[PDB]
Coordinates of C-alpha atoms in Angstrom, one line a residue:
Chain M
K1 CA -14.4 1.6 16.6
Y2 CA -11.0 2.6 15.7
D3 CA -9.1 4.1 12.8
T4 CA -5.5 3.1 12.5
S5 CA -5.4 5.8 9.4
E6 CA -7.2 8.9 11.5
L7 CA -5.5 7.9 14.5
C8 CA -2.3 8.2 12.4
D9 CA -3.0 11.8 12.0
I10 CA -3.9 13.0 14.8
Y11 CA -1.2 11.6 17.3
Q12 CA 1.2 11.6 14.6
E13 CA 4.4 10.3 16.0
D14 CA 3.1 10.4 19.6
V15 CA 2.2 6.3 17.9
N16 CA 4.4 4.4 16.8
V17 CA 3.5 1.9 13.9
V18 CA 4.0 -1.9 13.9
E19 CA 5.3 -3.4 9.7
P20 CA 2.7 -4.8 7.4
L21 CA 3.6 -8.0 8.5
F22 CA 0.2 -9.1 9.7
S23 CA -4.0 -9.9 9.2
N24 CA -6.9 -10.5 10.4
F25 CA -7.9 -13.6 11.5
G26 CA -11.0 -12.7 14.2
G27 CA -14.4 -11.5 15.3
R28 CA -13.8 -8.5 14.5
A29 CA -12.0 -5.7 12.1
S30 CA -10.9 -3.3 14.0
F31 CA -9.8 -3.4 18.3
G32 CA -7.8 -2.2 21.0
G33 CA -6.4 -1.7 24.7
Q34 CA -3.8 -1.6 27.6
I35 CA -1.3 -4.6 26.8
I36 CA 0.3 -7.4 28.2
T37 CA 3.2 -8.6 27.1
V38 CA 4.9 -12.4 26.7
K39 CA 8.0 -14.2 25.9
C40 CA 7.1 -17.6 24.2
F41 CA 7.6 -20.1 20.9
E42 CA 6.3 -22.6 20.1
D43 CA 5.1 -23.4 23.6
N44 CA 1.0 -21.8 24.7
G45 CA 1.0 -23.0 28.6
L46 CA 1.6 -19.4 29.4
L47 CA -1.1 -18.8 27.2
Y48 CA -3.5 -20.1 28.6
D49 CA -2.2 -19.6 32.3
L50 CA -3.1 -15.8 31.5
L51 CA -6.7 -16.0 29.4
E52 CA -8.0 -17.8 32.1
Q53 CA -7.2 -14.3 33.7
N54 CA -9.9 -10.7 33.1
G55 CA -9.2 -9.0 30.1
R56 CA -11.7 -6.5 29.8
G57 CA -9.8 -3.9 28.5
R58 CA -6.8 -5.4 27.4
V59 CA -4.1 -7.0 24.7
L60 CA -2.7 -10.0 24.6
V61 CA 1.3 -9.3 22.7
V62 CA 2.8 -12.6 21.8
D63 CA 6.5 -12.2 20.2
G64 CA 6.9 -15.8 19.1
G65 CA 9.6 -15.7 18.6
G66 CA 8.0 -15.2 14.9
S67 CA 7.9 -19.0 13.5
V68 CA 5.0 -20.1 11.9
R69 CA 6.4 -23.7 12.1
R70 CA 3.6 -24.1 15.4
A71 CA -0.2 -22.4 15.4
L72 CA -0.6 -21.0 19.7
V73 CA -3.4 -20.5 19.9
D74 CA -6.2 -21.9 18.4
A75 CA -9.7 -22.0 19.2
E76 CA -10.1 -23.4 22.7
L77 CA -8.2 -20.9 23.3
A78 CA -9.1 -18.8 21.8
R79 CA -12.7 -19.5 23.1
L80 CA -11.0 -18.9 26.4
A81 CA -10.3 -15.1 26.1
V82 CA -13.8 -15.1 24.6
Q83 CA -15.1 -15.8 27.9
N84 CA -13.4 -13.5 29.5
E85 CA -14.1 -10.4 28.0
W86 CA -10.0 -9.9 26.4
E87 CA -10.2 -7.2 23.3
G88 CA -7.9 -9.6 21.1
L89 CA -4.3 -10.7 20.3
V90 CA -1.6 -9.9 18.5
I91 CA -0.1 -13.0 17.8
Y92 CA 4.4 -12.3 16.3
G93 CA 3.4 -16.8 15.2
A94 CA 1.6 -18.7 13.5
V95 CA -2.3 -19.3 14.7
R96 CA -5.0 -22.3 13.7
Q97 CA -8.5 -23.5 12.9
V98 CA -8.9 -19.8 10.8
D99 CA -13.0 -21.4 9.5
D100 CA -13.5 -20.8 13.5
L101 CA -11.4 -18.2 14.8
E102 CA -13.9 -15.8 12.3
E103 CA -16.7 -16.8 14.4
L104 CA -15.3 -15.0 17.5
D105 CA -16.2 -12.3 19.1
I106 CA -12.5 -11.2 19.9
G107 CA -9.4 -9.4 17.5
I108 CA -6.4 -11.5 16.6
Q109 CA -3.8 -10.6 14.5
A110 CA -0.9 -13.4 13.5
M111 CA 1.3 -14.5 11.1
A112 CA 0.2 -16.8 9.9
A113 CA -1.2 -20.4 9.6
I114 CA 0.0 -24.2 10.3
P115 CA -2.1 -27.4 12.0
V116 CA 0.6 -28.4 14.5
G117 CA -0.6 -27.3 17.5
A118 CA 2.3 -25.9 20.0
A119 CA 3.0 -26.9 23.4
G120 CA 1.9 -27.1 26.5
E121 CA 4.9 -26.9 28.9
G122 CA 5.1 -23.0 29.6
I123 CA 8.7 -22.7 28.7
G124 CA 7.9 -18.8 28.6
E125 CA 8.0 -15.5 30.4
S126 CA 5.7 -12.3 30.9
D127 CA 5.4 -8.6 31.2
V128 CA 9.0 -8.2 29.5
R129 CA 9.8 -6.0 26.3
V130 CA 8.7 -7.7 23.3
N131 CA 10.3 -6.6 20.0
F132 CA 8.8 -7.3 16.8
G133 CA 7.4 -5.5 13.4
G134 CA 9.9 -3.0 14.5
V135 CA 8.3 -1.1 17.7
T136 CA 8.8 -2.3 21.3
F137 CA 6.6 -2.9 22.9
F138 CA 6.2 -3.0 26.7
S139 CA 3.3 -4.4 29.2
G140 CA 0.5 -1.2 30.1
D141 CA 1.0 0.7 26.1
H142 CA -1.9 0.6 23.9
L143 CA -2.0 -0.9 21.4
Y144 CA -5.2 -0.3 18.5
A145 CA -5.4 -2.4 15.4
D146 CA -7.4 -2.9 12.3
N147 CA -7.7 -4.2 8.9
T148 CA -4.5 -1.6 7.6
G149 CA -2.3 -2.0 10.7
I150 CA -1.7 -1.6 13.5
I151 CA 0.2 0.7 16.4
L152 CA 1.0 1.8 19.6
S153 CA 0.9 4.6 22.4
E154 CA 2.2 4.3 25.6
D155 CA -0.8 6.3 26.4
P156 CA -4.5 5.7 25.0
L157 CA -6.0 7.2 23.0
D158 CA -9.6 9.7 21.6
Chain B
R1 CA 15.1 -47.9 -21.1
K2 CA 12.1 -50.8 -23.1
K3 CA 12.2 -50.7 -27.2
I4 CA 9.3 -51.8 -29.3
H5 CA 7.8 -51.2 -32.5
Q6 CA 5.5 -48.2 -33.6
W7 CA 3.3 -46.8 -36.2
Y8 CA 0.4 -44.3 -37.2
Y9 CA -1.3 -44.6 -39.7
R10 CA -3.8 -41.7 -40.0
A11 CA -7.8 -41.7 -40.4
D12 CA -10.3 -39.7 -42.2
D13 CA -13.2 -41.0 -40.1
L14 CA -14.7 -41.9 -36.6
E15 CA -15.7 -44.8 -38.6
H16 CA -12.5 -45.2 -40.7
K17 CA -10.8 -45.1 -38.0
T18 CA -12.7 -47.5 -36.7
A19 CA -12.2 -50.3 -39.4
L20 CA -8.8 -49.1 -39.6
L21 CA -8.6 -50.9 -35.8
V22 CA -11.4 -53.9 -37.0
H23 CA -8.8 -55.0 -39.6
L24 CA -5.4 -54.5 -38.0
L25 CA -7.4 -56.6 -34.8
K26 CA -7.4 -59.7 -37.3
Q27 CA -3.4 -60.3 -37.6
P28 CA -2.6 -63.7 -37.1
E29 CA 0.4 -61.3 -35.3
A30 CA -1.8 -59.5 -32.9
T31 CA -1.3 -61.5 -29.5
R32 CA -2.8 -60.3 -26.2
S33 CA -4.0 -56.3 -27.5
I34 CA -5.2 -53.2 -25.3
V35 CA -6.4 -50.6 -26.6
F36 CA -7.1 -47.3 -25.1
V37 CA -9.7 -45.0 -25.9
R38 CA -9.8 -40.8 -24.9
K39 CA -13.4 -40.5 -23.2
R40 CA -15.6 -42.8 -21.2
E41 CA -18.7 -43.2 -23.5
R42 CA -16.2 -44.4 -26.4
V43 CA -15.6 -47.3 -24.3
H44 CA -18.3 -48.9 -24.7
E45 CA -19.2 -48.5 -28.4
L46 CA -16.3 -49.9 -29.5
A47 CA -17.1 -52.7 -27.8
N48 CA -19.9 -53.6 -29.7
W49 CA -17.7 -52.0 -32.8
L50 CA -15.6 -55.2 -32.0
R51 CA -17.5 -58.3 -31.4
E52 CA -19.8 -57.6 -34.0
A53 CA -16.2 -57.8 -37.2
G54 CA -16.5 -60.2 -35.5
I55 CA -13.8 -60.5 -32.8
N56 CA -14.4 -60.6 -29.2
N57 CA -13.1 -57.9 -26.8
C58 CA -13.5 -57.2 -23.5
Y59 CA -14.1 -54.3 -22.4
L60 CA -13.0 -52.2 -18.6
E61 CA -13.9 -48.8 -18.2
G62 CA -13.5 -47.1 -15.4
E63 CA -16.3 -47.0 -12.4
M64 CA -16.3 -50.8 -12.6
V65 CA -16.8 -52.5 -8.5
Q66 CA -13.3 -54.3 -8.3
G67 CA -15.0 -57.7 -9.4
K68 CA -16.2 -56.7 -12.6
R69 CA -12.8 -55.5 -12.9
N70 CA -11.0 -59.1 -12.3
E71 CA -14.1 -61.1 -14.6
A72 CA -13.0 -58.5 -17.5
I73 CA -9.2 -59.2 -16.6
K74 CA -9.6 -62.7 -16.1
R75 CA -11.3 -63.3 -19.4
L76 CA -8.4 -61.6 -21.6
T77 CA -5.8 -63.7 -19.7
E78 CA -7.5 -66.9 -21.2
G79 CA -7.9 -66.9 -25.1
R80 CA -11.3 -66.6 -24.3
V81 CA -10.7 -62.7 -25.1
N82 CA -8.1 -61.2 -26.6
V83 CA -9.0 -57.8 -26.8
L84 CA -9.0 -55.6 -23.9
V85 CA -10.8 -51.9 -24.5
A86 CA -10.8 -48.8 -21.5
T87 CA -9.7 -45.4 -20.2
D88 CA -6.4 -44.6 -18.5
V89 CA -8.5 -44.6 -14.7
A90 CA -9.9 -48.1 -16.1
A91 CA -6.7 -50.1 -16.0
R92 CA -4.4 -47.7 -13.6
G93 CA -3.7 -50.4 -10.8
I94 CA -4.2 -53.0 -13.3
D95 CA -0.6 -55.8 -14.5
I96 CA -1.4 -58.2 -17.7
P97 CA 0.6 -60.5 -19.0
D98 CA 2.8 -61.4 -22.2
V99 CA 1.0 -58.9 -24.2
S100 CA 2.2 -58.1 -27.5
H101 CA -0.5 -54.6 -29.2
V102 CA -1.3 -51.7 -27.7
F103 CA -3.0 -49.2 -29.9
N104 CA -3.8 -45.8 -29.4
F105 CA -7.9 -45.2 -30.8
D106 CA -7.5 -41.8 -29.6
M107 CA -4.5 -39.9 -29.1
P108 CA -2.9 -38.7 -25.5
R109 CA -1.9 -34.6 -24.9
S110 CA 0.8 -36.0 -23.2
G111 CA 4.2 -38.1 -23.6
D112 CA 4.0 -39.4 -20.1
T113 CA 0.5 -40.9 -20.6
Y114 CA 1.6 -42.3 -24.4
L115 CA 4.9 -44.3 -22.4
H116 CA 2.7 -45.4 -19.9
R117 CA 0.8 -46.5 -23.0
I118 CA 2.6 -48.4 -24.3
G119 CA 4.9 -49.4 -21.7
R120 CA 1.9 -52.4 -21.3
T121 CA 3.6 -54.8 -24.0
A122 CA 5.4 -57.5 -22.0
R123 CA 9.2 -56.9 -21.9
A124 CA 8.5 -60.9 -22.0
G125 CA 11.2 -60.3 -23.8
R126 CA 9.9 -61.3 -27.4
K127 CA 8.8 -57.7 -28.4
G128 CA 5.1 -55.6 -28.8
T129 CA 4.0 -52.9 -31.1
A130 CA 1.9 -49.9 -30.5
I131 CA 0.1 -48.7 -32.7
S132 CA -1.7 -45.4 -32.6
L133 CA -4.8 -44.4 -34.8
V134 CA -4.8 -40.8 -35.9
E135 CA -8.0 -38.6 -37.2
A136 CA -6.8 -35.0 -38.3
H137 CA -8.1 -33.6 -35.0
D138 CA -5.3 -36.1 -33.6
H139 CA -2.6 -35.0 -35.6
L140 CA -0.3 -32.2 -33.4
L141 CA -0.9 -34.6 -30.9
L142 CA 0.5 -36.8 -32.4
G143 CA 3.5 -34.9 -33.3
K144 CA 4.0 -33.1 -29.7
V145 CA 4.3 -36.6 -28.0
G146 CA 6.9 -38.0 -31.9
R147 CA 9.0 -35.5 -29.9
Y148 CA 8.5 -36.4 -26.2
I149 CA 9.5 -39.2 -28.0
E150 CA 13.1 -40.2 -29.0
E151 CA 11.8 -40.4 -32.4
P152 CA 8.7 -40.2 -34.5
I153 CA 6.8 -42.8 -34.8
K154 CA 7.0 -43.5 -38.3
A155 CA 3.9 -43.6 -41.0
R156 CA 2.0 -46.7 -43.1
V157 CA -0.6 -47.7 -45.0
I158 CA -3.0 -51.0 -45.4
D159 CA -3.2 -51.7 -49.0
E160 CA -7.1 -51.9 -49.5
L161 CA -8.2 -49.2 -46.7
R162 CA -7.3 -46.7 -47.9
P163 CA -8.0 -42.7 -46.5
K164 CA -9.6 -41.2 -49.2
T165 CA -8.5 -37.2 -48.0
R166 CA -5.4 -35.9 -47.5
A167 CA -2.7 -35.0 -45.1
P168 CA -3.0 -31.4 -42.3
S169 CA -0.6 -29.1 -42.4
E170 CA 2.1 -29.2 -40.5
Chain H
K1 CA -16.0 -31.3 6.5
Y2 CA -12.1 -31.8 6.9
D3 CA -10.2 -30.1 10.1
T4 CA -6.2 -30.7 9.7
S5 CA -5.4 -29.1 13.2
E6 CA -7.0 -31.9 14.7
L7 CA -6.3 -34.9 12.6
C8 CA -2.9 -33.1 14.3
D9 CA -4.1 -33.6 17.4
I10 CA -4.6 -36.3 16.9
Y11 CA -1.7 -37.8 14.2
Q12 CA 1.1 -36.2 15.7
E13 CA 4.2 -37.1 14.0
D14 CA 1.2 -39.6 11.7
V15 CA 0.9 -36.7 9.3
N16 CA 3.4 -35.1 8.0
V17 CA 2.7 -30.9 7.8
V18 CA 3.8 -28.5 3.9
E19 CA 4.9 -25.7 5.0
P20 CA 2.5 -22.9 4.9
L21 CA 2.9 -21.8 1.3
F22 CA -0.5 -21.9 -1.0
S23 CA -3.8 -20.4 -0.8
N24 CA -7.2 -21.7 -1.4
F25 CA -9.6 -20.4 -4.8
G26 CA -11.3 -22.9 -5.3
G27 CA -15.4 -23.4 -4.7
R28 CA -14.4 -26.1 -1.7
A29 CA -12.6 -24.8 1.6
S30 CA -11.4 -28.3 2.9
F31 CA -10.4 -31.4 0.6
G32 CA -9.5 -34.8 0.3
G33 CA -8.2 -38.0 -0.8
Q34 CA -5.7 -40.3 -3.1
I35 CA -2.4 -38.6 -4.2
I36 CA -1.6 -38.6 -7.9
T37 CA 1.5 -36.4 -8.6
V38 CA 2.5 -35.1 -11.3
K39 CA 5.6 -32.7 -12.2
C40 CA 6.4 -30.6 -15.2
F41 CA 7.3 -26.7 -15.3
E42 CA 5.0 -24.0 -16.9
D43 CA 2.8 -26.7 -19.5
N44 CA -0.3 -28.5 -18.6
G45 CA -0.9 -30.5 -21.9
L46 CA -1.0 -33.7 -19.2
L47 CA -2.8 -32.5 -16.3
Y48 CA -4.6 -32.3 -19.0
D49 CA -4.9 -36.0 -19.5
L50 CA -5.0 -36.7 -16.4
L51 CA -7.8 -35.1 -15.2
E52 CA -10.3 -36.3 -18.5
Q53 CA -10.6 -39.4 -16.1
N54 CA -12.1 -40.2 -13.6
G55 CA -11.1 -38.7 -10.0
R56 CA -13.3 -38.9 -7.4
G57 CA -11.0 -40.0 -3.8
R58 CA -8.1 -37.5 -5.5
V59 CA -6.3 -35.1 -5.4
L60 CA -3.9 -33.6 -8.2
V61 CA -0.6 -32.9 -6.5
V62 CA 1.0 -30.2 -8.9
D63 CA 5.4 -29.7 -8.6
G64 CA 4.9 -27.1 -11.8
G65 CA 8.5 -26.3 -9.8
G66 CA 6.9 -23.1 -7.6
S67 CA 6.8 -21.0 -11.1
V68 CA 4.2 -17.9 -11.0
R69 CA 5.2 -16.9 -14.6
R70 CA 3.1 -18.8 -15.9
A71 CA -0.2 -20.3 -14.6
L72 CA -1.2 -24.1 -15.1
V73 CA -5.7 -24.7 -14.7
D74 CA -7.3 -22.1 -15.8
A75 CA -11.4 -22.0 -15.6
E76 CA -11.3 -24.3 -18.3
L77 CA -8.9 -26.6 -16.9
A78 CA -10.7 -27.0 -13.5
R79 CA -15.0 -27.2 -14.8
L80 CA -12.7 -30.6 -16.9
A81 CA -11.7 -31.7 -13.5
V82 CA -14.8 -30.6 -11.5
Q83 CA -16.8 -32.2 -14.4
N84 CA -15.1 -35.5 -13.3
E85 CA -15.2 -35.1 -10.4
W86 CA -11.3 -34.7 -8.7
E87 CA -11.6 -33.8 -5.5
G88 CA -9.5 -30.9 -5.6
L89 CA -5.8 -30.1 -6.6
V90 CA -2.9 -28.6 -4.7
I91 CA -0.7 -26.9 -7.3
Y92 CA 3.1 -25.5 -6.7
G93 CA 3.1 -23.1 -9.2
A94 CA 0.0 -20.6 -10.1
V95 CA -2.7 -20.6 -10.8
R96 CA -5.8 -18.2 -13.1
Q97 CA -9.0 -16.5 -14.0
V98 CA -9.9 -16.3 -10.0
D99 CA -13.1 -15.1 -9.6
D100 CA -13.8 -18.4 -12.6
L101 CA -12.3 -21.0 -9.7
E102 CA -13.8 -19.5 -6.7
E103 CA -17.3 -21.0 -8.3
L104 CA -16.2 -24.1 -8.8
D105 CA -17.4 -27.3 -6.9
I106 CA -13.8 -28.0 -6.0
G107 CA -10.1 -27.6 -4.2
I108 CA -7.2 -25.7 -4.9
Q109 CA -4.7 -24.4 -3.5
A110 CA -1.7 -22.2 -5.5
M111 CA 1.2 -20.3 -4.9
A112 CA -0.3 -16.6 -6.7
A113 CA -2.2 -16.2 -9.9
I114 CA -0.7 -14.7 -12.7
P115 CA -2.8 -15.0 -17.2
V116 CA -0.5 -15.8 -18.0
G117 CA -1.8 -19.7 -19.4
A118 CA 0.9 -22.6 -20.3
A119 CA 2.6 -24.3 -22.9
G120 CA 0.4 -27.5 -23.3
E121 CA 3.4 -29.5 -25.8
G122 CA 2.4 -32.4 -22.7
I123 CA 6.2 -32.0 -21.1
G124 CA 5.7 -33.3 -17.8
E125 CA 6.7 -37.3 -15.5
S126 CA 3.7 -38.8 -14.0
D127 CA 3.9 -40.9 -11.3
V128 CA 7.0 -39.7 -9.7
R129 CA 8.2 -38.8 -5.9
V130 CA 8.4 -34.9 -5.8
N131 CA 9.7 -32.1 -3.0
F132 CA 7.8 -29.0 -2.1
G133 CA 7.1 -27.4 1.0
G134 CA 9.5 -29.5 3.3
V135 CA 7.4 -32.8 2.6
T136 CA 8.0 -35.8 -0.2
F137 CA 3.9 -36.9 -2.2
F138 CA 4.0 -39.7 -4.2
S139 CA 0.8 -41.2 -5.7
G140 CA -0.8 -43.6 -3.6
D141 CA -0.5 -41.2 -0.4
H142 CA -3.3 -39.7 1.0
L143 CA -3.6 -35.4 1.3
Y144 CA -6.5 -32.7 2.9
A145 CA -6.1 -29.8 3.2
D146 CA -8.5 -26.3 4.4
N147 CA -7.8 -23.3 5.7
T148 CA -5.7 -24.0 8.0
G149 CA -2.9 -25.8 5.9
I150 CA -2.6 -29.0 4.0
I151 CA -1.3 -32.2 5.4
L152 CA -0.4 -35.9 3.4
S153 CA -0.2 -39.4 5.2
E154 CA 0.6 -42.6 3.9
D155 CA -2.9 -44.4 5.3
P156 CA -6.3 -43.3 4.8
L157 CA -7.5 -41.2 8.1
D158 CA -10.1 -41.5 10.5
Chain A
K1 CA -16.0 -5.9 -17.9
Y2 CA -12.1 -7.5 -18.0
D3 CA -10.9 -10.9 -17.7
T4 CA -6.2 -10.4 -18.2
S5 CA -6.2 -14.2 -18.6
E6 CA -8.2 -14.5 -21.8
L7 CA -6.7 -11.1 -23.1
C8 CA -3.7 -12.7 -23.6
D9 CA -5.2 -15.7 -24.1
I10 CA -6.0 -13.9 -27.3
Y11 CA -3.4 -10.1 -27.6
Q12 CA -0.1 -13.4 -26.6
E13 CA 3.6 -11.7 -26.7
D14 CA 1.3 -8.2 -27.9
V15 CA 0.6 -7.6 -24.2
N16 CA 3.0 -7.9 -21.1
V17 CA 3.1 -9.3 -17.2
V18 CA 3.8 -7.6 -14.8
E19 CA 4.5 -9.2 -11.2
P20 CA 2.6 -10.6 -8.7
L21 CA 3.3 -8.2 -6.4
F22 CA -0.2 -6.4 -6.2
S23 CA -4.4 -6.7 -5.1
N24 CA -7.0 -5.2 -5.3
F25 CA -8.4 -2.1 -2.6
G26 CA -10.9 -0.4 -4.6
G27 CA -15.2 -1.8 -4.9
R28 CA -13.8 -2.4 -9.2
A29 CA -12.8 -6.6 -8.9
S30 CA -11.3 -5.7 -12.9
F31 CA -10.8 -2.3 -14.4
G32 CA -8.8 -0.5 -17.2
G33 CA -7.7 2.4 -19.8
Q34 CA -5.2 4.5 -21.2
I35 CA -2.5 5.7 -18.5
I36 CA -1.1 8.2 -16.9
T37 CA 2.4 7.5 -14.6
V38 CA 4.4 10.1 -11.8
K39 CA 6.8 9.0 -10.0
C40 CA 7.2 10.1 -6.2
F41 CA 8.4 9.3 -2.7
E42 CA 5.9 9.0 0.1
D43 CA 4.5 12.5 -0.9
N44 CA 1.2 12.4 -2.5
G45 CA 0.7 16.3 -3.8
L46 CA 1.5 15.5 -6.9
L47 CA -1.5 12.9 -7.1
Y48 CA -3.6 15.5 -5.9
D49 CA -1.9 18.1 -8.4
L50 CA -3.5 15.0 -11.0
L51 CA -7.1 13.2 -10.0
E52 CA -8.6 16.8 -9.9
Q53 CA -8.2 16.5 -12.6
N54 CA -10.5 14.2 -14.6
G55 CA -10.0 11.0 -16.1
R56 CA -12.9 8.6 -17.8
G57 CA -10.8 6.4 -19.1
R58 CA -7.5 7.4 -17.4
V59 CA -5.7 4.8 -15.3
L60 CA -3.0 6.2 -13.0
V61 CA -0.2 4.6 -12.5
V62 CA 2.5 5.2 -9.6
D63 CA 6.2 4.6 -9.3
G64 CA 6.3 5.3 -5.7
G65 CA 9.2 3.8 -4.6
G66 CA 7.4 0.4 -3.5
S67 CA 7.9 2.0 -0.3
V68 CA 5.0 0.6 2.6
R69 CA 6.6 2.7 5.1
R70 CA 4.3 5.5 4.0
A71 CA 1.1 5.2 2.5
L72 CA 0.2 7.2 -0.9
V73 CA -4.1 6.4 -1.0
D74 CA -5.3 7.5 1.7
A75 CA -9.8 7.6 2.2
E76 CA -9.5 11.4 1.0
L77 CA -8.0 11.1 -2.3
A78 CA -9.3 7.8 -3.0
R79 CA -13.5 9.3 -3.4
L80 CA -11.4 12.8 -5.5
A81 CA -10.5 9.8 -8.2
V82 CA -13.8 8.4 -7.9
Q83 CA -15.4 12.0 -8.1
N84 CA -13.6 12.9 -11.3
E85 CA -14.7 10.0 -13.3
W86 CA -10.9 8.2 -12.8
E87 CA -11.0 4.0 -14.3
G88 CA -8.9 2.5 -10.9
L89 CA -5.6 3.5 -9.8
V90 CA -2.2 1.2 -9.8
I91 CA 0.5 1.8 -7.1
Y92 CA 4.0 0.2 -6.8
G93 CA 3.8 1.6 -3.3
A94 CA 1.2 1.4 0.2
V95 CA -2.7 2.4 0.5
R96 CA -4.3 3.5 3.4
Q97 CA -7.7 2.6 5.2
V98 CA -8.4 -0.9 3.6
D99 CA -11.8 -1.1 3.9
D100 CA -13.4 2.3 2.7
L101 CA -11.7 1.6 0.0
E102 CA -13.3 -1.6 -0.7
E103 CA -16.8 0.2 -0.4
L104 CA -16.2 3.1 -3.3
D105 CA -16.5 2.3 -6.8
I106 CA -12.4 2.7 -8.6
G107 CA -10.1 0.1 -9.2
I108 CA -7.1 -0.1 -7.0
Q109 CA -4.3 -2.5 -7.0
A110 CA -1.3 -2.0 -4.2
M111 CA 1.0 -3.6 -2.8
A112 CA 0.5 -3.4 1.5
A113 CA -1.3 -1.4 3.0
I114 CA -0.4 1.4 6.0
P115 CA -1.9 3.4 8.8
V116 CA 0.6 6.7 8.5
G117 CA -0.6 9.1 4.9
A118 CA 2.0 10.1 2.7
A119 CA 4.2 13.8 2.9
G120 CA 2.6 16.1 0.7
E121 CA 4.5 18.2 -0.6
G122 CA 4.6 18.0 -4.2
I123 CA 8.0 16.4 -5.0
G124 CA 8.0 14.3 -8.7
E125 CA 7.5 13.4 -12.0
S126 CA 4.7 13.0 -13.5
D127 CA 5.0 11.5 -17.4
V128 CA 7.7 9.5 -17.5
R129 CA 9.0 6.3 -17.9
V130 CA 8.6 3.7 -14.6
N131 CA 9.7 0.8 -14.3
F132 CA 8.9 -1.6 -11.6
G133 CA 7.4 -5.4 -11.0
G134 CA 9.2 -5.9 -14.6
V135 CA 7.3 -3.9 -16.8
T136 CA 8.3 -0.7 -18.4
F137 CA 5.0 2.0 -18.8
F138 CA 5.0 4.9 -20.6
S139 CA 2.0 7.8 -20.8
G140 CA -0.6 6.9 -22.7
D141 CA -0.2 3.3 -22.5
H142 CA -2.5 1.2 -22.2
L143 CA -3.4 -1.5 -18.8
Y144 CA -6.0 -3.2 -18.1
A145 CA -6.4 -5.6 -14.3
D146 CA -8.6 -8.2 -12.6
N147 CA -7.8 -10.1 -9.6
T148 CA -5.6 -12.1 -11.4
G149 CA -2.8 -9.2 -12.3
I150 CA -2.3 -6.1 -13.9
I151 CA -1.4 -6.4 -18.4
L152 CA -0.3 -3.8 -20.9
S153 CA 0.0 -3.4 -23.7
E154 CA 0.6 0.0 -27.0
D155 CA -2.1 0.1 -28.1
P156 CA -6.4 -0.5 -26.8
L157 CA -7.3 -4.3 -26.4
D158 CA -9.8 -5.3 -28.5

């Protein structure tokens, strides 16, 4: 239960709203938590590393360069996230096997769908500011998202 | 790009339209003809219609297992037969040799289809003939096609067999 | 029934991936076949000639020039394709009467809907090399599509 | 009730087509009626004054400037539209509470969703000519919309 439009009405300026660039791909329509950011590009070695870890109460915010040439998340990687209790994923990038994703009990917001997987090298960086859709993200910020859009605050809400 | 004699006859009835072909096939000129149709069902019949008239016609329609599709094709390049009936799909990946007449029993919506049909005739050199038979429901289609292609198809009339109703509006 | 991601994972670079420009409008979620190609522009007289024929195991691939001014396929012409068992249609163009197209057992992917129909002068060419989405199509290529994307190869797959 | 493709077939050039920029957010798939125009930007004071009046058989058409930074229509205001029996809304701009809007017996076409609500000051004009999507709009005109698109005519169709 998160209403991003209700939240905007309440906290006003104290939230930042992300551009309307994304769409729901996961099993949850609304979701939120405390983010951990990632910078990468057409690679998801790092994603496999972090999602192998536990994430109750946590969202993974991934700056993927905006690529839609290569998918960063497939069913395997999302099944991974779900068994480790992750609230959801925000991918400034592409995703994959959308039919499988709608079924998994995780929020997924990304930009498009492309059949090609990313590479598995591991070239990237985590816990770093990322920036996209007109908003800055640091690890330990809080993120709230549903079908209407995505909002972000530095403190927790409710 | 190639060049072929092209004519058309308008018709009143399905029945007329098929006597037109009958007459036109019984001509010494006719040598190896292929006749196109549109509907699946009409391949079977028109083939019957043809024998009766006294013309060995062989019918080829696009489900046929590829073996039959060759047994059909082989009869035609053998003097056994000089009429093939088919649809646009039914004859897609086939080269047949030394054709001299292509008939459009049914008119196509597009000049692209038209052009592939009459593209069948030879190039041996010696120059084939494409004849369209137009029922009044095909009239627009005959014009649309004509405009597609460089030029219109000149009309003709068989003295004996003759259209007992008027030509359509425009 | 087909999974374009698993295929890319297998065939790697023996497939070519279309850019994510299209979405599903038909009743079949995925599909695949031998392609027949058409280049045309806001006209469908020729698509009626092609889809009147039998296309079990076949996909019609249409370079409609990317126009969203004019619908190339509408319910009428979709019922006709379905009736002749055509696997699915890929249209670099617009489609029409979406509510009716979704209830049909055929795969259709296309760029947008617009309610004005195409002309029917018959203008167009067929079995030609065509280009769009970063891929070249020609008759006899094999296309496979789902809700994640479109892929194409020269030879069949599995 | 309405099939916009058939209507275009029938009325040909007596009908202008809007460009495919919009989508349905309301419960009604298709709707239609006599139109009142409103011009504003990121403010919906005018919309409240307007949707309080009754509007059976009427459609509200909003040049919102195309802004997607601030949402002109939230759940609150859609309700007041239902209450006063309004046929549907057309917004060149953004809406809000997408999840609430689809449960609502009205028609809603818009460009995007953004969780930030519009100001309420009242700044704008009504019953003026407006222009977007390559169609130009006067109050008194007639709009019919479904999932395929939106079309406009001077006199009522049927």
